[PDB]
Design a protein around this ligand. Structure first.
Ligand SMILES: Cc1cc2nc3c(=O)[nH]c(=O)nc-3n(C[C@H](O)[C@H](O)[C@H](O)COP(=O)(O)O)c2cc1C
Length: 147
């Protein structure tokens, strides 16, 4: 299986998360391409991937704002080759804000209108993902099983 993992992380929580999902994947026999959104490009980004996992933190406080590095890609999802593509989304937040992990919400929806297949619902980590370590391992686990 060929997986793509793209992430936008500010204080590196979602990045740690991405790393955990990657190693879970890799340990299962998947080929894993892990990329910081800082550096990526949308034009056919997803082409040649059997699985695309999108990760992003939630900022904003009183409105939803996507992790900084992430926005540009988000603006361009219609150009990644998403349709028919099998995808899952993940991100860090804090349940204390009005819009808990609203960036996961946003991304999936856009994916969905694009014609992508959400094979599993989004992992919405509240707090330090080093403290949800298991959750992480388990969601990685169910995404494989739903492909
Ligand atoms: C000023 C600020 C605003 C935040 N706003 C939101 C928010 O609107 N929704 C939410 O789920 N979490 C929110 N959070 C918290 C985070 O997303 C949390 O810090 C996450 O662990 C950061 O991830 P990262 O390092 O990958 O970028 C905010 C954090 C700060 C400091």
């Amino acid at each position: 299986a060929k997986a793509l993992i793209v992430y936008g992380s500010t204080t590196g929580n979602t990045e740690y998360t991405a790393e955990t999902i990657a190693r879970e994947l890799a340990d299962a026999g998947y080929e894993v391409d892990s990329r910081d959104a800082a550096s990526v490009e949308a034009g056919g980004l997803f082409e040649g991937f059997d699985l695309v996992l999108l990760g992003c933190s939630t900022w904003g406080d009183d409105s939803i704002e996507l992790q900084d590095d992430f926005i540009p890609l988000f603006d361009s999802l219609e150009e990644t080759g998403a349709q028919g593509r099998k995808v899952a989304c993940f991100g860090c937040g804090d349940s204390s804000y009005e819009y808990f992990c609203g960036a996961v919400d946003a991304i999936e929806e856009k994916l969905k209108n694009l014609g992508a297949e959400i094979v599993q619902d989004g992992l919405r980590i509240d707090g330090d993902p080093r403290a949800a370590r298991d959750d992480i391992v388990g969601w990685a686990h169910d995404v494989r099983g739903a492909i």
